């Protein structure tokens, strides 16, 4: 089916308002960045706050958050369903 | 909500199997290319066949099919719901 986590072009502020209403930590979405056109941002509910990560790219075209590289957004998301997006607390991506 | 047209990483063959069953020209989806990691592919039903368009990116990261550039996939998609993706026929993007 289409990806439940891909929200297209929604402003950062709208993504935070929507994620802040979710019950579970790790609720998230991928949005097309409005500040850097062509870039994707991953917004994620962390307890009392919503954090935003830039989806970085390398010359090979890979996507990444820190150092492990992915051939697609879909692979990046799914990897983080099992490995935390945070170094200090265990936060896994969960569909809204 | 999430975009009805973003299918993440599904194979080109899967997009063809899905769209070939659609009854209307212009039924489409956007997927993450497996043969060109990091490229998006827009698959579209054209009557008889399913055509695959490469989503191109310019030096600033903007997206395009032919010449007009867009700040996100979402805007490229919406513009092609009323501007044909074909040069010889009028084929407008319609959600599956």
Coordinates of N, CA and C in Angstrom, one line a residue, chain B:
Chain B
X1 N -2.9 14.1 5.6 CA -2.5 12.7 5.9 C -1.4 12.3 5.0
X2 N -1.0 11.1 5.0 CA 0.1 10.6 4.1 C -0.3 10.6 2.6
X3 N 0.8 10.6 1.8 CA 0.5 10.7 0.4 C 0.0 9.3 -0.2
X4 N -1.1 9.3 -0.9 CA -1.7 8.1 -1.5 C -0.8 7.5 -2.6
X5 N 0.1 8.4 -3.2 CA 0.9 8.0 -4.3 C 2.3 7.6 -4.0
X6 N 2.8 7.6 -2.7 CA 4.2 7.2 -2.5 C 4.3 5.8 -2.0
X7 N 4.9 4.9 -2.8 CA 5.0 3.5 -2.5 C 6.3 3.0 -2.0
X8 N 7.3 3.9 -1.7 CA 8.5 3.4 -1.2 C 9.3 2.6 -2.1
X9 N 10.0 1.6 -1.5 CA 10.8 0.8 -2.4 C 10.1 -0.5 -2.8
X10 N 9.4 -0.4 -4.0 CA 8.8 -1.6 -4.6 C 9.5 -1.7 -5.9
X11 N 9.6 -2.9 -6.5 CA 10.3 -3.1 -7.8 C 9.5 -2.4 -8.9
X12 N 10.2 -2.1 -10.0 CA 9.6 -1.6 -11.2 C 8.6 -2.6 -11.7
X13 N 8.9 -3.9 -11.6 CA 7.9 -5.0 -12.1 C 6.7 -4.9 -11.3
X14 N 6.7 -4.6 -10.0 CA 5.6 -4.6 -9.1 C 4.7 -3.4 -9.5
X15 N 5.4 -2.2 -9.8 CA 4.6 -1.0 -10.2 C 3.9 -1.4 -11.5
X16 N 4.5 -2.1 -12.4 CA 3.9 -2.4 -13.7 C 2.7 -3.3 -13.5
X17 N 2.8 -4.4 -12.6 CA 1.8 -5.3 -12.3 C 0.6 -4.5 -11.7
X18 N 0.9 -3.6 -10.7 CA -0.2 -2.9 -10.1 C -1.0 -1.9 -11.1
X19 N -0.2 -1.1 -11.8 CA -0.8 -0.1 -12.7 C -1.5 -0.7 -13.9
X20 N -1.0 -1.9 -14.4 CA -1.5 -2.5 -15.6 C -2.9 -2.9 -15.3
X21 N -3.3 -3.2 -14.0 CA -4.6 -3.6 -13.7 C -5.6 -2.4 -13.6
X22 N -5.1 -1.2 -13.5 CA -5.9 0.1 -13.4 C -6.6 0.3 -14.6
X23 N -7.8 0.9 -14.5 CA -8.6 1.1 -15.7 C -8.4 2.5 -16.3
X24 N -7.9 3.5 -15.6 CA -7.7 4.8 -16.1 C -6.3 5.3 -16.5
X25 N -6.1 5.8 -17.6 CA -4.8 6.4 -18.0 C -4.4 7.5 -17.0
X26 N -3.1 7.5 -16.7 CA -2.7 8.5 -15.7 C -2.7 7.9 -14.3
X27 N -3.3 6.7 -14.0 CA -3.1 6.1 -12.6 C -1.6 6.0 -12.4
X28 N -1.1 6.3 -11.2 CA 0.4 6.4 -11.1 C 0.8 6.2 -9.7
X29 N 2.1 6.1 -9.5 CA 2.7 6.0 -8.2 C 4.1 6.4 -8.3
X30 N 4.7 6.8 -7.2 CA 6.1 7.2 -7.2 C 6.8 6.1 -6.3
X31 N 7.9 5.6 -6.8 CA 8.7 4.6 -6.0 C 10.1 5.0 -5.9
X32 N 10.8 4.4 -5.0 CA 12.3 4.6 -4.9 C 13.0 3.5 -5.8
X33 N 13.7 4.0 -6.8 CA 14.4 3.2 -7.7 C 15.3 2.2 -7.1
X34 N 15.3 0.9 -7.5 CA 16.2 -0.1 -7.0 C 17.4 -0.1 -8.0
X35 N 17.2 0.1 -9.3 CA 18.3 0.0 -10.2 C 19.2 1.3 -10.1
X36 N 18.6 2.4 -9.7 CA 19.4 3.7 -9.5 C 19.1 4.2 -8.1
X37 N 19.8 3.5 -7.1 CA 19.5 3.9 -5.7 C 19.6 5.4 -5.5
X38 N 18.6 6.0 -4.8 CA 18.7 7.5 -4.6 C 17.9 8.3 -5.7
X39 N 17.4 7.6 -6.7 CA 16.6 8.2 -7.7 C 15.1 7.8 -7.4
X40 N 14.2 8.7 -7.7 CA 12.8 8.3 -7.6 C 12.3 8.0 -9.0
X41 N 11.3 7.1 -9.1 CA 10.8 6.7 -10.4 C 9.2 7.0 -10.3
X42 N 8.7 7.6 -11.4 CA 7.2 7.9 -11.4 C 6.6 6.9 -12.4
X43 N 5.8 5.9 -12.0 CA 5.3 4.9 -12.9 C 3.9 5.3 -13.2
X44 N 3.5 5.2 -14.5 CA 2.3 5.7 -15.0 C 1.6 4.8 -16.1
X45 N 0.3 4.6 -15.9 CA -0.4 3.8 -16.9 C -0.7 4.7 -18.1
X46 N -0.3 4.2 -19.2 CA -0.5 4.8 -20.6 C -1.3 3.8 -21.4
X47 N -2.6 3.8 -21.3 CA -3.4 2.8 -22.1 C -3.0 1.4 -21.9
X48 N -2.3 1.0 -23.0 CA -1.7 -0.2 -23.2 C -0.5 -0.6 -22.3
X49 N 0.4 0.3 -22.0 CA 1.7 0.1 -21.3 C 1.7 0.9 -20.0
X50 N 2.8 0.6 -19.2 CA 3.0 1.4 -18.0 C 4.3 2.0 -18.4
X51 N 4.4 3.3 -18.3 CA 5.6 4.0 -18.6 C 6.3 4.4 -17.3
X52 N 7.6 4.5 -17.3 CA 8.4 4.8 -16.1 C 9.2 6.1 -16.5
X53 N 9.0 7.1 -15.6 CA 9.7 8.3 -15.8 C 10.7 8.4 -14.6
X54 N 11.9 8.9 -15.0 CA 12.9 9.2 -13.9 C 12.6 10.6 -13.4
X55 N 12.6 10.7 -12.0 CA 12.4 12.1 -11.4 C 13.8 12.8 -11.4
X56 N 14.0 13.7 -12.3 CA 15.3 14.4 -12.4 C 15.5 15.4 -11.3
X57 N 16.8 15.8 -11.0 CA 17.1 16.8 -10.0 C 18.1 17.7 -10.6
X58 N 17.9 19.0 -10.4 CA 18.8 19.9 -10.9 C 19.9 20.2 -9.9
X59 N 20.9 21.1 -10.2 CA 22.0 21.5 -9.3 C 21.5 22.0 -8.0
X60 N 20.3 22.6 -7.9 CA 19.9 23.1 -6.5 C 19.0 22.0 -5.8
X61 N 18.9 20.8 -6.4 CA 18.1 19.7 -5.7 C 16.6 19.7 -6.1
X62 N 16.2 20.7 -6.9 CA 14.8 20.7 -7.3 C 14.5 19.5 -8.3
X63 N 13.2 19.1 -8.3 CA 12.7 18.0 -9.1 C 12.0 18.4 -10.4
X64 N 12.2 17.6 -11.4 CA 11.5 17.8 -12.7 C 11.3 16.6 -13.5
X65 N 10.3 16.6 -14.5 CA 10.2 15.6 -15.4 C 10.7 15.9 -16.8
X66 N 10.5 17.2 -17.2 CA 10.9 17.7 -18.5 C 11.7 19.0 -18.3
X67 N 11.0 20.1 -18.1 CA 11.7 21.4 -17.9 C 11.3 22.2 -16.6
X68 N 10.0 22.2 -16.3 CA 9.6 22.9 -15.1 C 10.1 22.3 -13.8
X69 N 10.6 23.1 -12.9 CA 11.2 22.6 -11.7 C 10.3 22.7 -10.5
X70 N 10.4 21.8 -9.5 CA 9.6 21.9 -8.4 C 10.3 21.8 -7.1
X71 N 9.8 22.4 -6.0 CA 10.5 22.3 -4.7 C 10.3 21.0 -3.9
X72 N 9.4 20.1 -4.4 CA 9.1 18.9 -3.7 C 8.5 17.9 -4.7
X73 N 8.5 16.6 -4.3 CA 7.8 15.6 -5.2 C 6.3 16.0 -5.2
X74 N 5.8 16.4 -4.0 CA 4.4 16.7 -3.8 C 3.9 17.8 -4.9
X75 N 4.7 18.8 -5.1 CA 4.3 19.9 -6.0 C 4.5 19.4 -7.5
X76 N 5.5 18.5 -7.7 CA 5.6 18.0 -9.1 C 4.4 17.1 -9.4
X77 N 3.9 16.3 -8.4 CA 2.8 15.5 -8.6 C 1.5 16.4 -8.8
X78 N 1.3 17.3 -7.9 CA 0.1 18.1 -8.1 C 0.0 18.9 -9.4
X79 N 1.2 19.4 -9.8 CA 1.2 20.1 -11.1 C 0.8 19.2 -12.3
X80 N 1.3 17.9 -12.2 CA 0.9 17.0 -13.3 C -0.5 16.4 -13.2
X81 N -1.2 16.8 -12.2 CA -2.6 16.4 -12.2 C -3.4 17.2 -13.3
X82 N -2.8 18.3 -13.8 CA -3.5 19.2 -14.7 C -2.6 19.6 -15.9
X83 N -1.4 19.1 -15.9 CA -0.5 19.3 -17.1 C -0.1 17.9 -17.5
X84 N -0.2 17.5 -18.7 CA 0.1 16.2 -19.1 C 1.5 15.7 -18.9
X85 N 1.8 14.5 -18.5 CA 3.2 14.0 -18.5 C 3.6 13.6 -19.8
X86 N 2.7 13.5 -20.8 CA 3.1 13.1 -22.2 C 3.2 14.2 -23.1
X87 N 4.1 14.1 -24.1 CA 4.1 15.2 -25.0 C 3.1 15.1 -26.2
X88 N 2.7 13.8 -26.5 CA 1.8 13.6 -27.6 C 0.3 13.3 -27.2
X89 N 0.1 13.0 -26.0 CA -1.2 12.6 -25.5 C -1.4 13.4 -24.2
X90 N -2.7 13.6 -23.9 CA -3.0 14.2 -22.6 C -3.2 13.1 -21.6
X91 N -2.2 12.9 -20.7 CA -2.3 12.0 -19.6 C -2.0 12.7 -18.3
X92 N -3.0 12.9 -17.5 CA -2.9 13.6 -16.2 C -2.8 12.5 -15.0
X93 N -2.0 12.9 -14.0 CA -1.8 12.0 -12.9 C -3.1 11.8 -12.1
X94 N -3.5 10.6 -11.8 CA -4.7 10.3 -11.0 C -4.3 9.2 -10.0
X95 N -4.7 9.4 -8.7 CA -4.3 8.5 -7.6 C -4.9 7.1 -7.8
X96 N -4.1 6.1 -7.4 CA -4.7 4.8 -7.5 C -5.6 4.4 -6.4

